[PDB]
Amino acid sequence: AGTSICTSEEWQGLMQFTLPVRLCKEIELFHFDIGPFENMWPGIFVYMVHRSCGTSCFELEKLCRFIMSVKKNYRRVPYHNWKHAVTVAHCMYAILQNNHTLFTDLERKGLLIACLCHDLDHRGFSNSYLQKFDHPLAALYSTSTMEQHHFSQTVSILQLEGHNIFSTLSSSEYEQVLEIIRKAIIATDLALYFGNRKQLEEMYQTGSLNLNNQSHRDRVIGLMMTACDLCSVTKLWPVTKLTANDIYAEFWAEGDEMKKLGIQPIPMMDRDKKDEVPQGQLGFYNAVAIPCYTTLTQILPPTEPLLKACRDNLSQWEKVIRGEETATWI
Ligand SMILES: Nc1nc(=S)[nH]c2[nH]ncc12
Ligand code: NI
Ligand code: NI
């Protein structure tokens, strides 16, 4: 019920935060894992915004309020949580640093914010679930149900007193960045990814792709959003494997709810079908992750390390299937 707001202590603490110097170098790399630095997550996001956009891009007090209120509006769910938000924003930072002048100042600030916000107030349930059981959100948002909600949550937080980091934009640029953010969040609906990637692949392969064309830019930004959202598959194997445990914790909890409503869940969401997980991961990588990073690398060549890491993880799932897995901790 309603939008949560950070405390004075929370945002003033972020304002005074300083990032250890050794991490500065590490944060630039695609494979960086925020996992071991939880106390530093909000500060890491400030650092990224300041490196990409400038220390004066946002009023610091508004930015710190905004960040700490965003954190407070992620729920304590196993996967679609604050840690996921900051991970996705970091991937976007790495993409932006490596492709910096392809994107306008307004796009960079909008996309880093969109990434931080893109799963706001997620409940640990899929679009499939909300629509199957006619949750009020599915009535309000007929397609891309949760993503429309995440964008609405974003605008609610911006509207809190002292939280509007974009107020100093011209009236025109303000409308433009909100549209950047809306499009980017909606693009995180994997339903839309399949069509988007196929279109981009064609535009790329025929040579019609043109970044001066707004609809092309929109689609490229779309694919960047998918690549950042799925970036757990681009980390080192043990990190990827641990994150998969969190994703499946959510999936199995949803499947449990469907059993109670008289419907057998898809196997992926069935905690009594964990034997099918390795094959399911293979399916996901071949159908979703590999094509995403393949097309992204064609369009943005500096992103190739995402693709190489994704391929390496695909090989690991293949090893799991062949019974070659070694010791794992969870
Ligand atoms: N298998 C999957 N892995 C990730 S990171 N996300 C997913 N969404 N749906 C399936 C999966
Ligand atoms: Ni999402
Ligand atoms: Ni997400």
XYZ file of N, CA and C in Angstrom, residues 13-101:
267
model
N 23.603 9.467 4.667
C 24.650 8.451 4.704
C 25.219 8.145 3.329
N 24.347 8.010 2.325
C 24.790 7.812 0.930
C 25.600 9.011 0.423
N 25.149 10.218 0.754
C 25.871 11.420 0.339
C 27.323 11.424 0.783
N 27.572 10.956 2.002
C 28.925 10.936 2.575
C 29.752 9.713 2.152
N 29.109 8.733 1.510
C 29.800 7.495 1.131
C 30.917 7.733 0.121
N 32.040 7.057 0.353
C 33.166 7.035 -0.565
C 33.506 5.598 -0.914
N 33.626 5.359 -2.217
C 33.955 4.062 -2.795
C 35.452 3.778 -2.685
N 35.820 2.622 -2.097
C 37.220 2.202 -2.035
C 37.866 2.290 -3.402
N 39.111 2.752 -3.439
C 39.814 3.042 -4.692
C 40.066 1.835 -5.592
N 40.328 0.662 -5.006
C 40.580 -0.561 -5.784
C 39.398 -0.967 -6.668
N 38.187 -0.612 -6.231
C 36.962 -0.997 -6.932
C 36.711 -0.158 -8.164
N 37.180 1.092 -8.148
C 37.086 1.963 -9.322
C 37.484 1.248 -10.610
N 38.635 0.584 -10.615
C 39.126 -0.150 -11.796
C 38.221 -1.333 -12.185
N 37.687 -2.022 -11.175
C 36.927 -3.250 -11.368
C 35.529 -2.964 -11.921
N 34.918 -1.900 -11.415
C 33.577 -1.498 -11.859
C 33.460 -1.258 -13.386
N 34.570 -0.935 -14.054
C 34.534 -0.696 -15.508
C 34.363 -1.962 -16.328
N 34.647 -3.119 -15.732
C 34.645 -4.362 -16.482
C 33.265 -5.027 -16.555
N 32.960 -5.656 -17.688
C 31.659 -6.324 -17.863
C 31.405 -7.399 -16.825
N 32.439 -8.168 -16.491
C 32.271 -9.353 -15.630
C 32.217 -9.008 -14.138
N 32.291 -7.726 -13.791
C 32.286 -7.306 -12.382
C 31.027 -7.844 -11.706
N 31.205 -8.414 -10.515
C 30.099 -8.959 -9.706
C 29.952 -8.077 -8.486
N 28.796 -7.440 -8.357
C 28.578 -6.577 -7.178
C 28.379 -7.383 -5.910
N 28.111 -8.677 -6.063
C 27.734 -9.600 -4.955
C 28.448 -9.343 -3.619
N 29.777 -9.264 -3.624
C 30.504 -9.246 -2.333
C 30.539 -7.879 -1.659
N 29.783 -6.896 -2.152
C 29.930 -5.496 -1.692
C 28.609 -4.853 -1.334
N 27.731 -5.604 -0.672
C 26.352 -5.171 -0.531
C 26.206 -3.766 0.093
N 26.982 -3.466 1.136
C 26.883 -2.147 1.800
C 27.162 -0.989 0.837
N 27.889 -1.296 -0.241
C 28.349 -0.312 -1.202
C 27.435 -0.117 -2.416
N 26.425 -0.965 -2.567
C 25.579 -0.903 -3.756
C 25.023 0.477 -4.114
N 24.377 1.195 -3.153
C 23.887 2.524 -3.521
C 25.020 3.465 -3.977
N 26.175 3.366 -3.319
C 27.337 4.204 -3.590
C 27.905 3.853 -4.950
N 27.856 2.578 -5.303
C 28.321 2.127 -6.613
C 27.478 2.761 -7.729
N 26.163 2.805 -7.543
C 25.293 3.454 -8.505
C 25.605 4.949 -8.607
N 25.787 5.635 -7.470
C 26.189 7.061 -7.538
C 27.453 7.240 -8.356
N 28.443 6.380 -8.114
C 29.720 6.431 -8.793
C 29.534 6.287 -10.293
N 28.742 5.301 -10.693
C 28.456 5.091 -12.120
C 27.749 6.264 -12.801
N 26.728 6.810 -12.148
C 26.055 7.997 -12.677
C 27.051 9.157 -12.824
N 27.865 9.386 -11.795
C 28.839 10.472 -11.874
C 29.907 10.251 -12.947
N 30.361 9.014 -13.153
C 31.352 8.753 -14.229
C 30.747 8.900 -15.607
N 29.527 8.399 -15.788
C 28.888 8.430 -17.106
C 28.333 9.805 -17.434
N 27.695 10.438 -16.448
C 26.862 11.620 -16.680
C 27.441 12.925 -16.109
N 28.386 12.810 -15.172
C 29.037 13.973 -14.536
C 28.549 14.167 -13.114
N 29.415 14.668 -12.226
C 29.015 14.912 -10.826
C 27.919 15.980 -10.660
N 27.757 16.837 -11.667
C 26.739 17.901 -11.631
C 25.477 17.596 -12.451
N 25.364 16.375 -12.975
C 24.211 15.992 -13.785
C 22.926 16.093 -12.968
N 23.001 15.621 -11.735
C 21.883 15.657 -10.815
C 22.283 16.425 -9.555
N 21.324 17.108 -8.935
C 21.512 17.622 -7.582
C 21.742 16.427 -6.648
N 22.853 16.435 -5.915
C 23.253 15.282 -5.116
C 22.199 14.847 -4.089
N 21.582 15.799 -3.393
C 20.583 15.458 -2.374
C 19.393 14.759 -2.984
N 18.916 15.259 -4.129
C 17.779 14.643 -4.815
C 18.153 13.234 -5.292
N 19.338 13.108 -5.895
C 19.851 11.799 -6.355
C 19.928 10.762 -5.227
N 20.432 11.168 -4.063
C 20.588 10.252 -2.930
C 19.253 9.860 -2.356
N 18.328 10.827 -2.250
C 16.940 10.510 -1.873
C 16.314 9.534 -2.859
N 16.459 9.849 -4.139
C 15.893 9.008 -5.170
C 16.441 7.579 -5.044
N 17.774 7.417 -5.034
C 18.354 6.068 -4.901
C 17.844 5.304 -3.666
N 17.893 5.943 -2.497
C 17.509 5.220 -1.295
C 15.990 4.904 -1.228
N 15.146 5.746 -1.815
C 13.741 5.403 -1.952
C 13.477 4.278 -2.975
N 14.203 4.310 -4.078
C 14.145 3.166 -5.015
C 14.425 1.844 -4.269
N 15.507 1.805 -3.501
C 15.894 0.601 -2.752
C 14.750 0.134 -1.857
N 14.118 1.097 -1.212
C 13.065 0.747 -0.260
C 11.784 0.262 -0.955
N 11.674 0.457 -2.269
C 10.513 -0.018 -3.014
C 10.748 -1.282 -3.852
N 11.915 -1.887 -3.662
C 12.161 -3.288 -4.049
C 11.794 -4.161 -2.857
N 11.117 -5.270 -3.123
C 10.639 -6.180 -2.058
C 11.697 -7.209 -1.727
N 11.526 -7.919 -0.613
C 12.510 -8.899 -0.157
C 12.152 -10.254 -0.771
N 12.217 -10.296 -2.103
C 11.978 -11.492 -2.878
C 13.333 -12.094 -3.246
N 13.342 -13.384 -3.623
C 14.634 -14.049 -3.876
C 15.472 -13.500 -5.034
N 14.830 -13.032 -6.102
C 15.589 -12.598 -7.287
C 15.301 -11.179 -7.779
N 14.019 -10.814 -7.926
C 13.679 -9.500 -8.531
C 13.712 -8.435 -7.454
N 14.909 -8.202 -6.941
C 15.153 -7.403 -5.750
C 16.193 -6.306 -6.030
N 16.596 -5.605 -4.978
C 17.560 -4.517 -5.088
C 18.891 -4.941 -5.700
N 19.363 -6.120 -5.334
C 20.619 -6.613 -5.851
C 20.519 -6.767 -7.385
N 19.401 -7.300 -7.839
C 19.170 -7.433 -9.292
C 19.167 -6.038 -9.962
N 18.466 -5.076 -9.367
C 18.424 -3.702 -9.921
C 19.833 -3.137 -10.141
N 20.721 -3.299 -9.160
C 22.029 -2.635 -9.200
C 22.906 -3.397 -10.236
N 22.714 -4.710 -10.294
C 23.455 -5.575 -11.272
C 23.104 -5.172 -12.694
N 21.826 -4.931 -12.923
C 21.376 -4.561 -14.270
C 21.907 -3.164 -14.602
N 21.892 -2.263 -13.622
C 22.412 -0.906 -13.864
C 23.897 -0.921 -14.130
N 24.622 -1.808 -13.430
C 26.055 -1.911 -13.690
C 26.318 -2.411 -15.118
N 25.539 -3.379 -15.603
C 25.795 -3.878 -16.973
C 25.585 -2.710 -17.952
N 24.572 -1.909 -17.684
C 24.253 -0.802 -18.551
C 25.384 0.199 -18.518
N 25.909 0.504 -17.341
C 27.093 1.356 -17.217
C 28.244 0.877 -18.097
N 28.565 -0.416 -18.017
C 29.662 -1.001 -18.800
C 29.394 -0.880 -20.301
N 28.159 -1.142 -20.717
C 27.789 -0.953 -22.131
C 27.966 0.525 -22.525
N 27.457 1.452 -21.700
C 27.523 2.889 -22.012
C 28.996 3.367 -22.071
N 29.832 2.961 -21.098
C 31.245 3.399 -21.097
C 31.942 2.950 -22.358
N 31.638 1.737 -22.793
C 32.295 1.185 -24.007
C 31.742 1.711 -25.329
N 30.583 2.365 -25.282
C 29.926 2.900 -26.484
C 29.481 4.375 -26.284
N 30.234 5.100 -25.462
C 29.795 6.343 -24.838
C 29.155 7.360 -25.799
N 29.843 7.701 -26.884
C 29.352 8.798 -27.712
C 28.247 8.386 -28.719
